[PDB]
């Protein structure tokens, strides 16, 4: 993954500065690891996950479901933020996640903004905004 | 505009407390005057512009031509911003703008999340992310099929 034209110079700019962009970061990491049981252990009990153009997800057993199919059509393989910041109980990471569809072996640089919502560390809320239909033409998969 | 069932509930979530948090703020404000005009005096000279789902625009002519144009056939009816926060030299939103189709009278309520780059409180990046299809969709228009190219021309 390739720095777009458009990344702010500075390093700091996709560094944490907080307890909870370190926690996001940890969990920006993780992503890689396309094990849903891994991950879900960083949210809340009141908790949602939406990937913005399909349907949201309520509540940790859905957040897991759901992250656990999509784990067997695409993996992540790999993750690069080059934007964070945040406010209280909200972080937000502009990044491009390298998203592999397994029907075909396709991959795509996914340009993806995303916000994280907090409490005590813990994820109440993730939400990703990307276009769909640009990531289906890409992998030759429709996944609406 | 309504707010989404997901949204932080502290009052505080969608307001500003920074400098900067605040002038983003002002241009969300700005954007229902559906001015290109108006919106390019927010810009640094070294900017840019995206929608995520169309071609980027580089340098304030490209920027205000990329509004103009968009302009041109929808309105932005309404901005509500859920959700703000920001680090040096950079401010995001999440939020939902009203936009009104003028080719088929039909609107649309496109949840975004944009960014904001910064120097001494002037524009030099904006980028918005959202779901081209489900707005074309609701609004009964191939958009992508006639902003792409123009967004092509713009470059
Ligand atoms: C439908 C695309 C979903 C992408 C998701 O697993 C991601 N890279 O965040
Ligand atoms: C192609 C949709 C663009 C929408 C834009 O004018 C906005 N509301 O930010």
Redesign the interface.
């Known amino acids: 993954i390739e720095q777009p034209r ?1 990344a ?1 110079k ?1 390093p ?2 996709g560094k944490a ?1 907080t307890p909870d962009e370190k926690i996001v970061l940890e969990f920006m990491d993780a992503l890689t690891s396309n094990d849903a049981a891994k991950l879900i252990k960083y949210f809340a009990e009141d908790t ?1 996950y ?1 990937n ?2 399909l349907p ?1 997800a309520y509540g940790r057993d859905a957040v897991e479901q759901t992250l656990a199919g999509l784990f067997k059509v695409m993996s992540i393989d790999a993750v690069e933020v080059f ?10 990471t ?1 990044r491009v996640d390298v998203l592999r569809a397994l029907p075909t072996g396709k991959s795509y640089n996914l ?5 994280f ?1 907090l409490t005590d560390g813990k994820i109440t ?1 993730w ?1 990703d ?6 990531f289906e033409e890409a992998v030759d998969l429709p996944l609406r």
């Open positions: 458009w702010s500075d700091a700019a500065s949602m939406q913005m153009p949201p934007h964070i910041g945040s406010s209280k109980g909200l972080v937000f502009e340009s993806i903004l995303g916000v919502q809320g939400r905004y990307f276009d769909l239909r640009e």
